Amino acid sequence: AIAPNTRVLVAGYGLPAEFCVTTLIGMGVEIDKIAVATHREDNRNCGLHSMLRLRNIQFTTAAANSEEFYEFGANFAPDMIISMHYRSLIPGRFLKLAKKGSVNLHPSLLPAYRGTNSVAWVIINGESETGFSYHRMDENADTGAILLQERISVEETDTAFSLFHRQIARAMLRLEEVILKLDQGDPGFAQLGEASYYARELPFGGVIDPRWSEVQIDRFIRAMFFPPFPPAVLYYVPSIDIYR
Amino acid sequence: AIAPNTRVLVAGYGLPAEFCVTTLIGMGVEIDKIAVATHREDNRNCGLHSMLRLRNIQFTTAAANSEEFYEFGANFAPDMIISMHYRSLIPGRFLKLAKKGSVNLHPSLLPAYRGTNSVAWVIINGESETGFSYHRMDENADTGAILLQERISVEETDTAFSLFHRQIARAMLRLEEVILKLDQGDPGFAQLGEASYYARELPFGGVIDPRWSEVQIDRFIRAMFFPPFPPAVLKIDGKVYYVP
Ligand SMILES: C[C@H]1O[C@H](OP(=O)(O)OP(=O)(O)OC[C@H]2O[C@@H](n3cnc4c(=O)[nH]c(N)nc43)[C@H](O)[C@@H]2O)[C@@H](O)[C@@H](O)[C@@H]1N
Ligand SMILES: Nc1nc2c(ncn2[C@@H]2O[C@H](COP(=O)(O)OP(=O)(O)O)[C@@H](O)[C@H]2O)c(=O)[nH]1
Numbered sequence A: 001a002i003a004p005n006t007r008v009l010v011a012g013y014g015l016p017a018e019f020c021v022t023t024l025i026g027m028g029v030e031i032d033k034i035a036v037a038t039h040r041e042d043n044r045n046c047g048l049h050s051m052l053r054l055r056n057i058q059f060t061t062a063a064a065n066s067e068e069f070y071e072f073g074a075n076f077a078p079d080m081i082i083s084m085h086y087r088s089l090i091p092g093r094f095l096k097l098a099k100k101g102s103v104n105l106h107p108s109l110l111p112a113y114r115g116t117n118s119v120a121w122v123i124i125n126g127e128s129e130t131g132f133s134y135h136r137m138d139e140n141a142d143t144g145a146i147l148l149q150e151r152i153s154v155e156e157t158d159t160a161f162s163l164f165h166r167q168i169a170r171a172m173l174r175l176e177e178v179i180l181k182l183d184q185g186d187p188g189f190a191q192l193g194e195a196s197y198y199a200r201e202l203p204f205g206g207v208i209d210p211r212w213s214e215v216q217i218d219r220f221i222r223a224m225f226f227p228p229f230p231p232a233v234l235y236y237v238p239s240i241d242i243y244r
Numbered sequence B: 001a002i003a004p005n006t007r008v009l010v011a012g013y014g015l016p017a018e019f020c021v022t023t024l025i026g027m028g029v030e031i032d033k034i035a036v037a038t039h040r041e042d043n044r045n046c047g048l049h050s051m052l053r054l055r056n057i058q059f060t061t062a063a064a065n066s067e068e069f070y071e072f073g074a075n076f077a078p079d080m081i082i083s084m085h086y087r088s089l090i091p092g093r094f095l096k097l098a099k100k101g102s103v104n105l106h107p108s109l110l111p112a113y114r115g116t117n118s119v120a121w122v123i124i125n126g127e128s129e130t131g132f133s134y135h136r137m138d139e140n141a142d143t144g145a146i147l148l149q150e151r152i153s154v155e156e157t158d159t160a161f162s163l164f165h166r167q168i169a170r171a172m173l174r175l176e177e178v179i180l181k182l183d184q185g186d187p188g189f190a191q192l193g194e195a196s197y198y199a200r201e202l203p204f205g206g207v208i209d210p211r212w213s214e215v216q217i218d219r220f221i222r223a224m225f226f227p228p229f230p231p232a233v234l235k236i237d238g239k240v241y242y243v244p
Helices: A014-027 A046-055 A067-076 A118-124 A160-184 A214-223 B014-026 B046-055 B067-076 B092-096 B118-124 B160-172 B175-183 B214-224
Strands: A008-012 A034-037 A058-060 A080-084 A102-106 A129-135 A146-153 B008-012 B034-037 B058-060 B080-084 B102-106 B129-135 B146-153 B233-235 B240-242
Touching (some): A046 B014, A046 B046, A102 A160, A118 A129, A118 A160, A118 A214, A160 B014, A160 B160, B008 B014, B014 B034, B014 B080, B058 B067, B080 B175, B118 B129, B118 B160, B146 B175
Parallel strands (some): A008 A034, A080 A102, B008 B034, B008 B080, B034 B058, B080 B102
Antiparallel strands (some): A102 A129, A129 A146, B102 B129
């Protein structure tokens, strides 16, 4: 058991947050001991919103760097913060409010593939394995101590889509354990190894270079496959079948 | 791994269904090989609906007994049917469409606690132990062969609300494994032991009988806690009063 009267602030977006909140409830964290910071209701985030509305769980949508956000966290007074696909950098002074600190879910084997488009870049780079890292948040992104990593094999048929979704599902499976690590004060271990970082641009502008081998082309196609976004171009190429 | 081109129809509602569709995509099931039956857009079922529009997964909200619903199944031609908290009895002829059969998630250890309110009756009866059952669907409700049961211990602090959500959370951790059993044709085992049944109504109309002992009133109060709904009622001098 998590302590009674442990206060938990979830900063999150979409299913992972919904699942976290659900998990917290099954662990016996009462509604008034839960608060959610999120973003406006949208096509990914309206399962979370409808839950918060139905159950009357307190929440904010205010920007991470705003006084209203800080005020929301300060009034709540969290013991721990759980970032579950939160889409902004959380300022240091906000994290400071949580005496038992925090955790974020990142869909790579950190410090490898920090940043954005991680599942795309892993496919493009031809990785045989990737994974997910639950790590403490310090004031920079994805640099804080590792509480839990798990390895996920990348299949030859995986797409950005397939791998993104398996990342979520498998990560949820460890979430209860990680909350319990945070509760017990587990310090985790500092990130060691070859860091890498990727930004918000898809490479080659989403465009196939025909001098690439069949192996580079297929990778790119599979890394670009993510409905409803447009696929790789040559014209619209969602599979290596079509490429031929 | 799931046999590729396996066509899967999910009958469901809310987070369990969203999680299921997420898992299936994570397992490499293509979008045109998924189809969903659900109900009209709800404050519980908003997550799912937006997922289905977003990824353009085909779906219906027609009634389970309707010709439109049956045609939706007919045209999709599922290999398997996954009921994740679907709220109607699915006609037998509709189940016959899936040649690898079906599975439903029920939150008890079947055959105990067939029917609605299983989480509340478990608490009311003073079970220290319950669980969830993934079972094949017969023409009748909650009778078919068991593919997977896991035990969930009940605490003295558990409410219907904490237990309901823990049921969900824990059941999701076994979903992939259940899907693979269906894929590989595990017939499961016949439900053994003595079947108990509980009425569709809310237990004792949510009203505390004062002939009950302290222990039975405590359980009932915990069994009745489920926000946003009304809690246990005590009536005093022909007058309704909600319990804390
Ligand atoms: C960790 C990062 O979170 C957010 O970005 P993210 O890349 O990690 O995750 P999302 O934006 O939700 O996108 C999820 C996946 O959706 C895919 N995707 C995202 N945008 C596109 C796109 O424009 N075209 C194609 N073909 N695919 C796209 C990527 O494969 C990506 O991994 C942002 O809020 C970033 O600011 C943040 N650093
Ligand atoms: N207190 C209270 N709880 C309810 C009510 N309706 C449903 N619930 C709870 O919600 C849980 C699941 O309900 P639901 O999925 O709607 O129905 P079921 O799966 O057919 O029992 C049950 O265990 C109930 O305890 C109500 O009117 N009052």
